[PDB]
């Protein structure tokens, strides 16, 4: 059982005593601070609201547990038992908080307000920043979704250039990251963020998350195909790699199948085994059931180029309408080792220079997609901008002398469209002057209830590339 009284940074337990006396409102906001990655995909808050923040989240038992834990943790009694009891008694354990947010899937330039948080009861001034820790973890799905979308932009550009269309784009970057993330929960969140942009995943945890918290019209949001791992090749013994290959493509003769081919010698596997010994089993396959060859070691670009070079001399290559080389439809490649946004760029550029179509290849990305990310990439940050003390509203902010990049926004915030149709965040309550039309934030949480939410299909629509919008 999750306990929201135990789901904050320790020192926040002590903050209720530190605010100015007679403070009745604390108002805070989240942004991806301006400091590559010029725009972010807002995704993941809905999960957090539903899983952790909504409904009766305070009980007598949870207050006692927190009391006992913090007594030992601080070696002193500093826990606000009275504040939490108030919430329990007055609101039946529902949080007196109002959260406003940009729609999920929205693509927003850095430095804009993405959501705001304030208490709805003066007694709970301390509650706003108590839940900072939980809410700031939204950085992760935001960052995965953003970085995934940036990779889609690269793939789209090169696919359009070398093929003339975007067919297959949504399956070109496949989530291989399940084993390479830090936990089961992270796997689900991160996989779901990748599926904002793509439809290929092996991280099954993402499907369940999406079904429970977002929903899609389709039965599932993402797909995979049968494929070998090194163990199903190596188990046959070093002298029987060909036997393994033959068994596997025969077992999966009418559906796509990927076979990792670098257990011993990738170049030999491609040229002699696939290219000669088992060639007859490949050229007989359907366009809907290709063999996908998977190299998995060596320099990613050099290895991809060599594999294509080998296959191109053993199989009938065509030249598409753009002048780029294309493997026959029953044969494709996937590079699933060492792929991140940088190496992805290097490989597609290298292929283009060697006149190979991006139609030939798909990418699998694990740690690079889901784990090699931090809060510093987009500078996702939660800050207090407005308080009311003794009935007087004050615009508040930090502004460190040695780092102007850490300056925060002042006052009540709102998000607007400019006359040119761009986004602008108004500070100091200036949204109230109505010179910039209506606030684009929506109330998504209020007093323990989720008041607005988005289907995964809507989120996908919101996150589309301009070139997909055409």
290 binds, among ligand 3TQ, a second copy, none (CB under 5 to 8 A by kind): ligand 3TQ
C-alpha distance across the termini of the chain, in Å: 47
With contacts defined by CB under 6 A, name the span among 43-51, 58-66, 116-124, 358-366 that binds ligand 3TQ.
358-366
- 88/69 Cα distance (integer angstroms): 19
128 contacts 119 by C-beta, under 8 angstroms = yes
Residue 236 neighbours by CB under 8 Å, 6+ apart: 243, 244, 247
403 contacts 422 by C-beta, under 8 angstroms = no
If binding is defined by CB under 8 A, does position 61 make contact with a second copy? Answer: no
- 301/297 Cα distance (integer angstroms): 11
**How many residues in the shown chain lie near ligand 3TQ by CB under 6 A?**
19
Measured from the CB atom, is 3 or 14 closer to ligand 3TQ?
14
Q: Of 199-218, which residues contact ligand 3TQ (CB under 6 A)?
A: 200, 202
Measured from the CB atom, is 159 or 210 closer to a second copy?
210
- 410/392 Cα distance (integer angstroms): 15
Q: Of 301-320, which residues contact a second copy (CB under 8 A)?
A: 303
459 contacts 105 by C-beta, under 8 angstroms = yes
Q: Within 10 A of 166 (CB to CB), how many other CB atoms are there?
A: 18
120 binds, among ligand 3TQ, a second copy, none (CB under 5 to 8 A by kind): none
If binding is defined by CB under 8 A, does position 369 make contact with a second copy? Answer: no
With contacts defined by CB under 8 A, name the span among 152-160, 216-224, 414-422, 430-438 that binds a second copy.
216-224
Is residue 32 helix, strand or coil? strand
- 103/106 Cα distance (integer angstroms): 6
Residue 464 neighbours by CB under 8 Å, 6+ apart: none
Q: Of 305-334, which residues contact ligand 3TQ (CB under 6 A)?
A: 334
Site string for a second copy, 374-413 (x = CB under 8 A): xxx-----xxx--x-x----x-xxxxxxxx--x-------
Rg of the chain in Å (alpha carbons): 26
222 is in an annotated binding site: no
If binding is defined by CB under 6 A, does position 241 make contact with ligand 3TQ? Answer: no
337 is in an annotated binding site: yes
Q: Of 268-307, which residues contact ligand 3TQ (CB under 6 A)?
A: 290, 292
If binding is defined by CB under 6 A, does position 198 make contact with ligand 3TQ? Answer: no
- 293/227 Cα distance (integer angstroms): 10
If binding is defined by CB under 6 A, does position 11 make contact with ligand 3TQ? Answer: yes
Interaction site with ligand 3TQ (CB under 6 A)? 9, 11, 171, 174, 176, 200, 202, 224-225, 227, 256, 258, 290, 292, 334, 336, 362, 364, 366
């Amino acid at each position: 059982e999750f306990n929201i009284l135990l789901a904050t940074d320790s020192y926040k337990v002590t903050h209720y005593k530190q605010y100015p006396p007679n403070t009745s409102k604390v108002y805070s906001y989240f942004e991806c601070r301006e400091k590559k990655y010029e725009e972010t995909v807002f995704y993941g808050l809905q999960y957090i609201l539903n899983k952790y923040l909504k409904g009766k989240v305070v009980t007598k038992e949870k207050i006692q547990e927190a009391k006992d834990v913090y007594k030992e943790h601080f070696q002193d009694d500093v826990f606000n038992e009275k504040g939490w009891n108030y919430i329990l008694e007055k609101y039946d354990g529902h949080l007196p908080i109002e959260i406003k947010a940009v729609p999920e899937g929205f693509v927003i330039p850095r430095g804009n307000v993405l959501f705001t948080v304030e208490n709805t009861d003066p007694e709970c001034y301390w509650l706003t920043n108590w839940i900072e820790t939980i809410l700031v973890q939204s950085w992760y799905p935001i960052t995965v979704a953003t970085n995934s979308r940036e990779q889609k932009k690269i793939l789209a550009k090169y696919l359009l250039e070398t093929s003339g269309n975007l067919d297959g784009l949504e399956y070109k970057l496949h989530d291989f990251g399940y084993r390479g993330v830090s936990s089961q929960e992270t796997a689900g969140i991160g996989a779901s963020a990748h599926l904002v942009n793509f439809k290929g995943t092996d991280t099954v945890a993402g499907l369940a998350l999406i079904k429970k918290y977002y929903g899609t019209k389709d039965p599932v949001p993402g797909y995979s195909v049968p494929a070998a791992e090194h163990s199903t090749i190596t188990a046959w013994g070093k002298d029987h790699e060909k036997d393994a290959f033959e068994h596997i493509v025969t077992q999966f003769s009418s559906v796509p199948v990927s076979v990792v081919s670098d257990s011993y010698d990738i170049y030999n596997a491609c040229e002699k085994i696939w290219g000669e010994d088992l060639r007859h089993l490949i050229v007989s396959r359907s366009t809907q059931a290709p063999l996908i060859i998977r190299p998995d070691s060596g320099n990613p670009l050099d290895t991809v180029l060599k594999v294509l070079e080998i296959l191109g001399k053993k199989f009938p290559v065509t030249e598409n309408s753009k002048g780029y080389k294309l493997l026959p439809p029953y044969l494709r490649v996937i590079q699933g080792d060492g792929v991140d946004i940088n190496t992805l760029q290097e490989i597609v550029e290298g292929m283009k220079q060697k006149m190979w179509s991006i139609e030939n290849i798909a990418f699998g990305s694990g740690g690079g997609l889901l784990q090699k990310l931090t809060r510093d990439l987009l500078n996702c940050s939660f800050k207090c901008s407005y308080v009311v003390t003794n009935g007087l509203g004050i615009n508040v902010f930090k502004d460190p002398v040695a780092d102007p990049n850490k300056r925060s926004k002042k006052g009540r915030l709102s998000l607007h469209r400019t006359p040119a149709g761009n986004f602008v965040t108004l500070e100091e309550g200036k949204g109230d002057l109505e010179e910039y039309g209506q606030d684009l934030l929506h109330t998504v949480f209020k007093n323990g209830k989720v008041t607005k939410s988005y289907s995964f299909d809507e989120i996908r629509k919101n996150a589309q590339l301009n070139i997909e919008l055409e």
